[PDB]
């Protein structure tokens, strides 16, 4: 038990980019998403990730 | 990510003759770990 | 060659994978040193 709320826990139901799993890294080590022109964010059949 | 370490040793040609032979390669040392990786290209060695 | 690099990107602006190995065991440390480019020491 701890009391003052809880904000840590965050998974997905689906995701519009592949990431790359197994690296401890804080750089900006990014992949693409896809081709329609979501740009990594929310838009037209891309889903919120 | 077994990165196995499969290392024949051929040794540097030294002056004249160390033989070329055995083709092929096999195991010496084998460690997995599962590290990303996606894409790559040739690379190069170290004293 | 000074340095050994791997990775998906390979840019290492970042902690990065310190393997040393000498035959005896082999580091397995995420966080850079202080040798970037071309690492020397006189040793």
Redesign the interface.
């Known amino acids: 038990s701890k009391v003052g709320g809880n904000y840590n826990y965050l998974f997905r139901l689906f995701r519009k980019s592949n990431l790359k799993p197994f690296e401890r890294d804080i750089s900006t080590e990014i992949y693409q998403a896809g081709s329609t022109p979501c740009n990594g964010v929310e838009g037209f059949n891309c889903y919120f990730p | 990510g077994y990165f196995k370490i499969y290392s024949k040793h051929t040794p540097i040609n030294l002056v004249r003759d160390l033989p070329q032979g055995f083709s092929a390669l096999e195991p010496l040392v084998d460690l997995p770990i599962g590290i990303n990786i996606t894409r790559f290209q040739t690379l190069l060695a170290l004293h | 060659?000074?340095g050994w690099?791997?990775?998906?990107?390979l840019?290492?602006?970042?902690?990065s994978?310190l393997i040393v190995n000498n035959a005896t065991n082999?580091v397995?440390k995420?966080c850079e040193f202080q040798f970037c480019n071309d690492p020397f020491l006189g040793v």
């Open positions: 060659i000074r690099i791997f990775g998906t990107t840019d290492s602006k970042t902690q994978l082999v397995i995420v």
